Amino acid sequence: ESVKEFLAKAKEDFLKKWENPAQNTAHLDQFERIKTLGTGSFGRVMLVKHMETGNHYAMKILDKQKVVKLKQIEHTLNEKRILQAVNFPFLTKLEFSFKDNSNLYMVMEYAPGGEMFSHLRRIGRFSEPHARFYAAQIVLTFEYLHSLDLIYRDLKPENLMIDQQGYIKVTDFGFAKRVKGRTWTLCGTPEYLAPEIILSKGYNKAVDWWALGVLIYEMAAGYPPFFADQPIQIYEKIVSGKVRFPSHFSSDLKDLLRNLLQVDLTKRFGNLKNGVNDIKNHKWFATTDWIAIYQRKVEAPFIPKFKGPGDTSNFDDYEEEEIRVSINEKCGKEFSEF
């Protein structure tokens, strides 16, 4: 089949689940809490063991009251509805979801290799072949998501998890949205924001392709193309219309980056008549066998070190806090459909 045809069928699969979402498919007491793997403003991700199977999972736990205070109700409903409907090699679909008086719970495949962020900062930068290996998986994932009319909106190393085989999972769908037109919400991470977001224009999925340019730059340079100590200074840089590349960047890398980090939407790669093929058929991707990446048959350039199925040495240590469940239901109406 063509990719077109593969995607069309994946859309039929997605849409059935999108229109009739799974709801209340487990309970907290079915899991043993192991370790906090990360924290957000309104929640955390923990490693848990599912007792009936002994499988390990990542459990994202969101405090309903905190979600409400941060005006993230609709975004949170988006995340759960989308994640329970998708299926792709580089995504972690929801295995289960449920809620209780206090919290929302989303249970996903656990990625034991840790955050790309951690390895990238420690090692310093990745070689071009290394960066390319990751980038290809992102390119396929976005092609999938965009075909389902989904915009992702928070690409960054912090949210690219490495699996046992050294492949990646694109996680944190907190800003993901199914939208056919343009959308307007100011969201994302300062370093990764497209100019049109910063300038409060309506925008579309082209913001994901700009974000990819930021990521590939960061992976290959070891620092992002636009940085400063404060967000406002970062936004001045992004809109300014200039980017400098490290002398070690290949000619093909720089050319790809100029076409991704392009302020002009009529010229930005991924956004043109030829769609994602402008990116896939670019010279920097010449050695990339897209079918082999999708199949996860390419040998990963780097594989994290493990000693166990729930080893967590690739994660930072976070203060372990209780998972408290109030005796009173909080925010029932807001999260009715979750």
Binding site: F117, E158, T185, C187, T189, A221, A228, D229, Q230, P231
Partner: peptide, 20 residues
């Protein structure tokens, strides 16, 4: 160097999402 400027900056740790 640009590397030295990055490492000295306040944004080498995990970066929080923003919103309106």
């Amino acid at each position: 160097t640009t590397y030295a400027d990055f490492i000295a900056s306040g944004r080498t740790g995990r970066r929080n999402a923003i919103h309106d």
